[PDB]
Design a protein around this ligand. Structure first.
Ligand code: HEM
Ligand SMILES: CCCCCCCC/C=C\CCCCCCCC(=O)OC[C@H](O)CO
Ligand SMILES: CCCCCCCC/C=C\CCCCCCCC(=O)OC[C@H](O)CO
Ligand SMILES: [Cu+2]
Length: 309
């Protein structure tokens, strides 16, 4: 392919690896405790540090793989930030903002996680961790995207597209609102309001399906917030399908967003129905990661378009 130094494809490999590790750090948190002394332990059995005799269980692998990914992340992120900064910035000026964003948020989530060991009873603060971890991942994801695009003459995704004002409203607006919905979700978790409402879409058989207790209000607020996001994405997708059919990145970008929002909602309903089976929990952290990634991709398009035009 390219007669340049073979070490370059190693920067692409590092990008893929780190993006993957950062995704693991994020969605893996759906399987282990993030607060208290049992932090790092499978959520279903907070005791994994100390007393137990047995070893090599499938739940022990999860706990080892998460702590491993979290430790190795500092090494990987710093290396990717530096190397890509040194090599990719000449072509993409955005490279530096991303490298920096990657480092800052990796540290922010590590800082918040450290504090969660002892201040995990503050749900309002604890509910900030996911969104931070999410941006840590999205920063590395987009940086990796630029690393690949830097090595192509006909770029696949990072193309200078014409983004109209309305589409820009939807893109940026949905990006920001999705982050808010992400907070309400994290707030349900850390506030233990996950199973307050056995039914869907409404709360329960009693009180006409309306919340009448703390945990039911948190649960319901999350679902309500999610519904609005869902509807907005449908409106945004329809505008893309109608007015951006000639700009396939935007056309398909939103279709995939539509699909991720659907899978997010479905896995959310399944968390409830299954009474928080971690497999659905894991799915619920993963699809929002995909959707947010696409929204951050869109933000890069706008950032570049606003610089160009
Ligand atoms: C479609 C838009 C939705 C988005 C973007 C979204 C996002 C999130 C996020 C970011 C969390 C935090 C996860 C964590 O901290 O581990 C969460 C948790 C949760 N979500 Fe959603 N959610 C959506 C829809 C739903 C729906 C429709 C339901 C259910 C009817 C739902 C039920 C839950 C529950 C029960 C939790 C807490 C799970 C736990 O304790 O780990 N979500 N959501
Ligand atoms: C609401 C929360 C929103 C979270 C979005 C944050 C990071 C996404 C990753 C970066 C997306 C692309 C940004 C590109 C950019 O800003 O480039 C600037 C400029 O060229 C100078 O280097
Ligand atoms: C696993 C994580 C993989 C994430 C890789 C993101 C970069 C990418 O896939 O870029 C593709 C494009 O076609 C480039 O020209
Ligand atoms: Cu309670």
């Amino acid at each position: 392919h390219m007669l340049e130094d073979p070490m370059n494809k190693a920067l692409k490999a590092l990008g893929v690896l780190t993006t993957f590790v950062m995704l693991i750090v994020l969605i893996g948190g759906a399987l282990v405790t993030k607060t208290g002394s049992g932090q790092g332990c499978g959520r279903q059995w907070p005791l994994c540090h100390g007393r137990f005799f047995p070893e090599l269980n499938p739940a022990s692998i999860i706990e080892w793989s998460h702590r491993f990914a979290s430790g190795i992340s500092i090494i990987l992120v710093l290396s990717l930030a530096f190397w890509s900064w040194r090599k990719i910035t000449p072509i993409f000026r955005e490279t530096t903002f991303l490298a920096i964003m990657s480092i800052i948020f990796l540290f922010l989530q590590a800082l918040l996680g450290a504090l969660a060991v002892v201040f995990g009873s503050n749900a309002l603060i604890m509910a900030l961790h996911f969104g931070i971890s999410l941006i840590s991942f999205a920063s590395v994801l987009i940086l990796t995207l630029l690393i690949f695009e830097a090595d192509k003459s006909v770029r696949t995704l990072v193309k200078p597209l014409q983004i109209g004002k309305k589409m820009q409203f939807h893109m940026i607006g949905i990006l920001i609102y999705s982050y808010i919905v992400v907070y309400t979700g994290a707030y349900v978790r850390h506030t233990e309001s996950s199973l307050a409402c056995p039914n869907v879409p409404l709360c329960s058989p009693l009180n006409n399906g309306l919340p009448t207790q703390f945990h039911e209000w948190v649960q319901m607020g999350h679902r309500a917030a999610a519904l609005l996001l869902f509807v907005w994405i449908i409106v945004a997708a329809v505008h893309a399908i109608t007015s951006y059919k000639d700009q396939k990145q935007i056309f398909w970008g939103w279709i995939s967003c539509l699909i991720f929002i659907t899978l997010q909602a479905l896995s959310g309903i399944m968390i409830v129905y299954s009474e928080l089976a971690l497999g659905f929990a894991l799915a619920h952290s993963f699809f929002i990661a995909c959707l947010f990634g696409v929204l951050c991709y869109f933000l890069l398009l706008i950032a570049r378009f606003r610089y160009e035009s």
